[PDB]
Structure formats: C-alpha cells, structure tokens
Amino acid sequence: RPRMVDVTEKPETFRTATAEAFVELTEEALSALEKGKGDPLVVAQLAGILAAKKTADLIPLCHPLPLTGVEVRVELLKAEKRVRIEATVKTKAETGVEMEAMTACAVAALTVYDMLKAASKGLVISQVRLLHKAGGKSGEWRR
Amino acid sequence: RPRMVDVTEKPETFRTATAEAFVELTEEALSALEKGKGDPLVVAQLAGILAAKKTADLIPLCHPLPLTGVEVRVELLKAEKRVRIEATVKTKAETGVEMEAMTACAVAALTVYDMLKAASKGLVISQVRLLHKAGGKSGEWRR
Amino acid sequence: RPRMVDVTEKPETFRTATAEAFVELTEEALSALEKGKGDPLVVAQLAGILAAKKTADLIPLCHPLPLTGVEVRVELLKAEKRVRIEATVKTKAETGVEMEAMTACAVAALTVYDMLKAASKGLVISQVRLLHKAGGKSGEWRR
Amino acid sequence: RPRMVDVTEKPETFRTATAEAFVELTEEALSALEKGKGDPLVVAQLAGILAAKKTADLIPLCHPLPLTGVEVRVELLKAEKRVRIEATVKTKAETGVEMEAMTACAVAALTVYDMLKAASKGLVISQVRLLHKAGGKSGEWRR
Amino acid sequence: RPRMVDVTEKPETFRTATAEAFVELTEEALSALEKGKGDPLVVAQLAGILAAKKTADLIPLCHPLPLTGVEVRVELLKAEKRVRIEATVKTKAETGVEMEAMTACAVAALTVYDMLKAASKGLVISQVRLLHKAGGKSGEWRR
Amino acid sequence: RPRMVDVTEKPETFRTATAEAFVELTEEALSALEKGKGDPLVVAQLAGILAAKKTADLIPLCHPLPLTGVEVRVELLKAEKRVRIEATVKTKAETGVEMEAMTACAVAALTVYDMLKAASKGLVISQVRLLHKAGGKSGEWRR
C-alpha cells in the first residue's frame, strides 16, 4: 500500500536537485512574448519558487521539509522558439528534493502556458526532467 | 502589469477542457510498474484530481472557481513504454478550465515520477498539452 | 476509478447539512475544561468553521464550492462528562454539504483533543455523524 | 489566552504516534464496499497520509514540523461490519505527533464516509483514539 | 459565538472593493528600491493578487467565493519616500469583497517589507484602509 | 531575478521576532467592541497564530520553516480608542522570523477589521512594524 517511507533514522544531510522544462512556442506566442496580462516569464519565475514550497502538498507521498534555497530561471530562447525553465532547490534533510525541483519547473511551465494560451491554446510543455542531484546513499547523479 | 482579467460582466456558461501528459519509461521503470511504496498509477490518478482543485492556488493569475466535474485517467501503455495521463475538467463560469486540465495532468505525471525515481531518476515527463476545450467566445477547440 | 462526479448539468439549489461529534471526558479533562494554553471550547469552535471551508482540500473527490453559511457550537455537558459539537453548513450548489458539516465537527473535536491531551492522552472522539440534510434529489433526510 | 507553546529550548528527539478510527457499516454500505466513484478504502488511505501533512494547518495551536514517516491502513472487517483505520506518524522534534496520527485517521474516516454516504447517509465514525506514542518527557504511553 | 453569517437567501450581485496601503521608506530603502533578491515592487504586486485569492483561508469568518477580477498596483513615490499599494477586487456574490481588497494590500505591503528588511528592519507599513466598495444593502461607499 | 536566498550552509540557531500593529477605532466601533458575529479580539488573536504558520505560503521569497513558538495578543485600549496587536514568534533556523511576526500582526488586524467593518467600513490599520528580533549575523535589533 502507499506510504511515506520512514527516514526518521537517517542523518540530516545537504541535499540539492536541479531540473528543467521547456515550452515550445509558435510564431504567434513568440511575438507575444517579445512584446512582453503581464510578462509571462516574470510571473512564471515566481510561480516556480512558490510551487517548490508547495511540493509536499501536491505530491501525495512526498516528505514535507524546510527548504533552504530555491532558484528559478525562465528564459526565452528566440532562435529555438522556446522557453527554457531551470530550477535548483536545496535543503538539509533525510530525503532528496528532486520533486521540489521538478515541480517548480512544471508549475513555471504551466504558468507560461496560462499567460500565452489566449492566442495559442496548442502550446506544448515538451519536457520536464531532472538534470542533477546530490546527497543521499546513491550520491551524486547527472543526466 | 500582471492582473486577473476582469470577467465579472460575462455570463456564466458551461466550460470543459481536456489535456494529456506522458511519462517515458525505461525498462527498469516499466518492470517496476508491472510489479505494482504503492501503485504509481493509482496514487498519481488521485493526485491529479486533487491538483485540479488546487490550480488557482498554483497559477498566479488563474481565476478561482468551483469545479463541477473532474476525471483523470493514468494508464500504462506497455508496448509504447510509457504512461499516458488524460484529464477532463468541467464547470459553469466566466472563464475556461484549460489550466485545471493541464495542471491535473502535470501533477499526476510528477507523481508517477515520484513513485519511480528511486530506480530511475532520469525519467522524463515528455509532454503536457491541451487536447480540447469548449465554452467561451472562441468556442470549441481541438488539437 | 476514482472521480469527482459530474454535476455540471444539475441546477443550482439551496443545500444544508447538520452533523455532530462528541469527545468523552475523564474527570481530569473535565476539571481542566472547567478551569478554562487557552479555552479548548473556544479554539475548537473556530477550528470547525475554518475546517468547513477547507473540506474540499481534505476529501479527495469532494466538490469545491462557495459556502454561504457556517455555524459551529462546542458545548460542555458536565453531567454527561463530554463535549458536544454541532455544525450546520449551507450553500447553493449542484451537490450537498454533508462533508463540510462532518469535517467541521471532526476537526473541532480534534482541536478539543489537542487542547486536553497534555493531561489526558486517552480521550476519545466517540462519534461523528450526520443529523440532517436538505436539498438534492433524495430530498430531506433526518437521523 | 491561546498560544503555540514555546518549545524552542527543548532538544530535537525521535517522536512517534499511533491512532485508530472506525466507521460502522450498514448491510447496504458493506455490500457496496465489497463491490469496490472508486474504491473507498484506497482513496481514504491516501487522504489520511495527505491529512497527516496538513495537520498544523487544521489544528490552531499545533506546531508545524517536518514528518519523516507516515503509514496509514484502511481495512474492511466484514464480520464486524466496519472499517478500521490505523495511522502511525514519526518525526524528530520538540513536540509530539499525536495530532498528526489522530488527524490522519479522522480524515481517512471522513473519506470513507464521503465514498459511501450516497446510499448510507447515516454511517457513523464511531471512534477516533490514540493507541500509542513515544518520545517527550512523559515517555512511552499505551492505551 | 463566532459564525459565518448566513447569506444563502440573498441574491447574487455585482460586488467591488478597493483598498490601499503604504510602506514608509528610509533613504537606505529608497536607494535600494531605485537600484531594483529581486525587484520588491514586482514580487509584491504578484503576492497581492495571490493573497486576494487566499483571503477566506486567512480571515476566519470570511465567506469563500470565486473572484472574477483582481487588480493590484505597487508604485514607488520617490518624493514622498514611500510605496503605495492599491488593490481592486470584483465578484458576483451574496457578500462583499472588502476583505479581499484589504488583504491583497496588506500582503503586498508585507512583501515589500520582506524584500527590503535586510538593510532596513524598521520600515513601517503605515496604513491599510478601504477606499471604496459597491454592491450590497448599504450600497456604494467612499472614503 | 527573484530568489529564495541560499542559507543551506549557515548553522541552525535560535531566532526570535516581535512585531505589533494597530487598528484605530471610531466611537461606533469602540462601542461594538465593548459589547463584544463573535468577539473580534478573540477571533483575531487566533487568526494571528494561524497566519504566522502560513507566512511562507503568503510571502513569495520567504523560507519555509518549523516554528517552535507563537504568541499573539490582541488588546483593547479604550482611552486611546484603538486595538493593539503584538506577536512574538520563535524558531531554530538559518533565517529569521520577522516575516512571521509581521504577518501574524497584519492578519490579526485584518480580522479585527473584518469583525467591525459592518458598521465602520472606514476603520484603518494604522501601523504594522517590527519591535525586536534576535539571532543571525546582524544580532539583536530593537526599535
């Protein structure tokens, strides 16, 4: 059955996780983003930070923990016609923060979509994936 | 500047939105999902419904509204080696529920990832996209 | 599979629900309540109102809706050595508010327990049950 | 006046708490549960875990803390015609997690009720009580 | 005793509310704001919109309702050495949205303080007051 | 760009913060408060404690952390015709709790306003300011 894995007996260690996500743009959406309801990139960046803090409330079996660092970047890559979101979360705990990084990116992407769907309902959040993490038994991991 | 668009003077109408998302599986993850911390597909399905209701709290400029229907499906597509998530949300309001459908799919996908990252940290949430919506000025829309 | 039942096509009607709960007291707990960390009955009464509003966030398949009325009463029944909690919730919607009434009572009871567990950890929340409801196809119902 | 008791100067220690709750079934409800809106027992089990994490938000004077473990079990006891819910929560803190265990059980019970009230509005959540706890000055306690 | 006033029998009407708040700046804080952890005015503006939506969760007896419009402005008034926050909220309901407007301003002000307290811990949120409201029995009201 | 400042490498230390806020009363409001929808001072006091715990969810870049102590006082100062709110929050962390103290006072003030706006919509929350804090590099600070 589902359960929040017991990690009470594990030491408190430095954890970090970095993830990224992309939103593929149409020419219509790109134009809009270049013109600036508000700036999609700015609002999305903040939504990502807020989302990182709300992660345990969204992911059922996720361990609630105090975050000591959250960085989110939402950039427009004109030539590639897409928005790149990257998030790095840190803490000191018995479990990792991969979910916090992944959720920050996903919600920032959803926010970019929210800000541009008026003219482009077909915009796709192409990928959401982990790039790196450190801490824990498994140790350092890189894509 | 950012703002929650005023729709106070628009009539209250029947709205619907359907979105989908995918999680690409490695052979390791597929095996695990076939064996059943809990069943990833079951937990994710519920997380999606819960997420739909929490949408306005996650998307900054999203209009808060009472939902009258939420359907989420999380299925394993063995041959394609991936999990397909689909969500349909309904309501009667002055704005659409595309964000609720998109967020339900994104969070369900994040939950599948949470349940399988132990052995496969590189799993990717490949896409999150709108499939259909009805209601509003623009009328019916299909991918 | 689990789902938030579609009620989009049902008319918006006047709904009401009343529930109750009890906390059985030991002589130690009764004495404390008579002496007044704060007054358990006062804090619990407010927690119940707050809980009614948070119901859809706690009950997975519960329909989110705006409440138009919430009444909670937390009384000490000395001779019976127990605290009686009663809650009545109202709204205009396509679904009932039995869950809101039940949850308000349950959380108020949990709060009374929180305020008195220091000296009496064995206190029991004896019952939580629906007393009445009106509105909907089934019509009026009474215990 | 009400207050969140100051425990800043107390050491951080291993805490655990176990509680249980029951839902008394009618023959109608029992039949339904045996046939499986979704499986009441499965949805309730998850709601309990989620509820444990939301405890401090529901109980006014409750201390917010990171949980390191949450286990919830929702079982059908056919002969006894009732559902038994049990929850064990763990953490390392200056205060106990009795409220987290009690709330997990109460919300799981409320969810079972939500899933079966359609046909049986009179179902009763008979009891919610603490079974065990460890850690803190008072030490180990058992019902 | 406390209670969420019953307004179930009142018609659903157009409501609006406008409030404002100020943050008095020291020369140190003013300099910082002119140089731009992020832009205090931008982050605060978004926090205000988010806060408006979370109002019923923060104010105990406040009626939960769907908002149809939220506008927040956070401006620097150099000569006056202070930040002026203004918020207008709208909806269609049985109760007003004065609390939503007031809370949006208060939280935006708290956010400006958060972004500038590093160098100026003594900054004061001088006032938070209602400027206008319409709808309801009392009708239109202006400061 | 906005970011939750990284404090992962800072030691965990004892932090404390005290803030205050005022609500200026009209003779109408004063009379009401002396007569006792519920007692504004009692409801506001609890809202303040609850608000302290919800601070990180309201202030975008605020670090989420477990609080070990929360004290809130809401008093009527008849001669001065105003309500004085004071809040002290404590914890052990890498960052301070000034925001928790400030937010507790602001929300308690907003609640007093909510409870008295029926007859006095023009009531003003005159000030919200930090009175003291300890812990951190900067050390002890007093107004």
* Yes or no, beta carbons of D6 and F53 under 8 Å apart: no
Q: Identity (one letter) of the amino acid at C28?
A: E
CB count in 10 Å sphere of residue A92: 18
Half-sphere exposure at residue F84, Cβ-oriented, CA atoms within 13 angstroms: 9
Report strand pairing: B124-134 vs A124-134: antiparallel
Tokens of C67: 């409440």
Distance CA E31, CA E76 (A): 11
Of the residues D37, D39, D41, D42, the best mutation for testing chain B's interface (the one with the most B CB atoms within 10 Å of its CB) is: D42
Do F71 and F48 form a contact (C-beta atoms < 8 A)?
A: no
Distance CA D119, CA D17 (A): 34
Q: Is D105 annotated as a binding residue?
A: no
Distance CA A7, CA A9 (A): 5
Q: Which of F73, F62, D105 is nearest to C124 (CA)?
A: D105
Distance CA C33, CA B133 (A): 56
* Yes or no, beta carbons of A71 and F4 under 8 Å apart: yes
Indicate the residue of E2, E38, E99 with minimum beta-carbon distance to F61: E38
CA-only gyration radius of chain E, Å: 16
Q: Is B91 annotated as a binding residue?
A: no
Binding-site residues of A for substrate sit at 61-63, 99-100
Distance CA F94, CA F135 (A): 9
* Yes or no, beta carbons of E8 and C46 under 8 Å apart: no
The total number of residues written for chain C in this structure:
143
Q: Which of C49, C55, C86 is nearest to C70 (CA)?
A: C49
Distance CA C112, CA C103 (A): 14
Indicate the residue of A1, A61, A94 with minimum beta-carbon distance to D68: A94
Distance CA A19, CA A100 (A): 9
Identify residues after which chain B is interrupted (C–N over 2.5 A): 36
**Which chains border D (3 or more CB–CB pairs < 8 Å)?**
A, B, C, F
Do D3 and F87 form a contact (C-beta atoms < 8 A)?
A: no
Torsion angles phi and psi, residue B88, rounded to 5: -125, 125
Characterise C135 by phi-psi region: left (phi > 0), alpha (psi -120 to 50), beta (else): left
Half-sphere exposure at residue E64, Cβ-oriented, CA atoms within 13 angstroms: 25
Non-local CB neighbours of E68 within 8 Å, separated by 6+ positions? B6, B7, B8, B63, B94, E90, E91, E92
| DSSP string over chain B | ---B---TTS--EEEEEEEEEEEEPPHHHHHHHHH----HHHHHHHHHHHHHHHHHHHSTTPPP---SEEEEEEEEETTTTEEEEEEEEEEEESS--HHHHHHHHHHHHHHHHHHHTTT-TT-EEEEEEEEEEE-STT--EE-
Do C23 and C143 form a contact (C-beta atoms < 8 A)?
A: no
Distance CA C3, CA C9 (A): 16
Of the residues A14, A54, A70, A89, the best mutation for testing chain F's interface (the one with the most F CB atoms within 10 Å of its CB) is: A70
The string over C60-69, giving b where at least 16 C-beta atoms fall within 10 Å of a residue's C-beta and e elsewhere, is: bbbbbbbbbb
Q: Which residues pair with A142 in a beta bridge?
A: A132
Q: What is the dihedral of CA A115, A119, A124, A128, to 10 degrees?
A: -10
Helix (H, G, I), strand (E, B) or coil at A37: coil
| Sole residue written with tokens 């052995």 | B119
Q: Identity (one letter) of the amino acid at D49?
A: I
Q: Which residues pair with D71 in a beta bridge?
A: D88
Do D64 and D56 form a contact (C-beta atoms < 8 A)?
A: yes
Half-sphere exposure at residue C34, Cβ-oriented, CA atoms within 13 angstroms: 12
Q: Which of F65, F8, B125 is nearest to A16 (CA)?
A: F8
Binding-site residues of E for GTP sit at 37, 62-63, 95, 117-118
Distance CA F125, CA F36 (A): 20
Catalytic amino acids of B?
Answer: 114
Tokens of B60: 């900054």
Do E89 and E67 form a contact (C-beta atoms < 8 A)?
A: yes
Distance CA E100, CA E102 (A): 6
Q: Identity (one letter) of the amino acid at B45?
A: Q
| DSSP string over E90-141 | EEEESS--HHHHHHHHHHHHHHHHHHHTTT-TT-EEEEEEEEEEE-STT--E
Q: Which residues pair with A59 in a beta bridge?
A: none
User: Helical H runs in D15-73?
Assistant: 27-35, 40-58
Binding-site residues of E for substrate sit at 61-63, 99-100
* Yes or no, beta carbons of C43 and F46 under 8 Å apart: yes
* Yes or no, beta carbons of A67 and F66 under 8 Å apart: no
Q: Which residues pair with F15 in a beta bridge?
A: F91
User: Å from E7 to nearest chain A CA?
Assistant: 32
The total number of residues written for chain F in this structure:
143
What was the resolution (in A) of this experimentally determined structure? Answer: 1.8
Q: Which of B30, D36, D61, D143 is nearest to F48 (CA)?
A: D61
Q: Which of E37, A50, F53 is nearest to B62 (CA)?
A: A50
Do E138 and E55 form a contact (C-beta atoms < 8 A)?
A: no
**Which chains border B (3 or more CB–CB pairs < 8 Å)?**
A, C, D, E
Q: Which of A10, A4, A13, A8 is nearest to A91 (CA)?
A: A13
Q: Identity (one letter) of the amino acid at D82?
A: R
Q: Is D55 annotated as a binding residue?
A: no
* Yes or no, beta carbons of C71 and E4 under 8 Å apart: yes
Helix (H, G, I), strand (E, B) or coil at D42: helix
Distance CA E99, CA A108 (A): 29
User: Å from F129 to nearest chain A CA?
Assistant: 25
Q: Is C106 exposed, middle or buried (0-12, 13-18, 19+ CB in 10 A)?
A: buried
Tokens of A96: 């990792």
User: Å from C6 to nearest chain F CA?
Assistant: 31
Do F29 and F120 form a contact (C-beta atoms < 8 A)?
A: yes
CA angle D47, B125, B73 (to 5 degrees): 45
Torsion angles phi and psi, residue C27, rounded to 5: -65, -35
Q: Identity (one letter) of the amino acid at B77?
A: L
User: Å from F55 to nearest chain A CA?
Assistant: 12
| DSSP string over C31-76 | HHHHH----HHHHHHHHHHHHHHHHHHHSTTPPP---SEEEEEEEE
Q: Is C117 annotated as a binding residue?
A: yes
Distance CA F143, CA F138 (A): 14
Do C128 and C21 form a contact (C-beta atoms < 8 A)?
A: yes
Counted across chains A and D, CB pairs separated by less than 8 A come out at: 46
Distance CA D28, CA B27 (A): 44
Q: Is B63 annotated as a binding residue?
A: yes
The total number of residues written for chain B in this structure:
143
Indicate the residue of C1, C6, C64 with minimum beta-carbon distance to B66: C64
Tokens of E41: 């005015």
Segment (H or E) for E47: helix E40-58
Of the residues A45, A46, A111, the best mutation for testing chain E's interface (the one with the most E CB atoms within 10 Å of its CB) is: A46
Give the CATH superfamily of C1-143: Molybdopterin cofactor biosynthesis C (MoaC) domain (3.30.70.640)
Instruction: Collect all residues of chain E within an 8 Å Cβ-Cβ radius of residue C68.
Output: 6-8, 63, 94
Torsion angles phi and psi, residue E82, rounded to 5: -165, 160
Q: How far is CA E66 from the centre of its chain?
A: 17
Non-local CB neighbours of F99 within 8 Å, separated by 6+ positions? E110, E113, E114, F55, F59, F62
Catalytic amino acids of F?
Answer: 114
Q: Identity (one letter) of the amino acid at C56?
A: A
Instruction: Collect all residues of chain B within an 8 Å Cβ-Cβ radius of residue E14.
Output: 8
* Yes or no, beta carbons of C50 and E65 under 8 Å apart: no
Distance CA B8, CA A128 (A): 35
The string over A108-131, giving b where at least 16 C-beta atoms fall within 10 Å of a residue's C-beta and e elsewhere, is: bbbbbbbbbbeebbebbbbbbbbb
Method: X-ray
Distance CA B38, CA A2 (A): 4
The string over E98-128, giving b where at least 16 C-beta atoms fall within 10 Å of a residue's C-beta and e elsewhere, is: bbbbbbbbbbbbbbbbbbbbeebbebbbbbb
Non-local CB neighbours of E137 within 8 Å, separated by 6+ positions? none
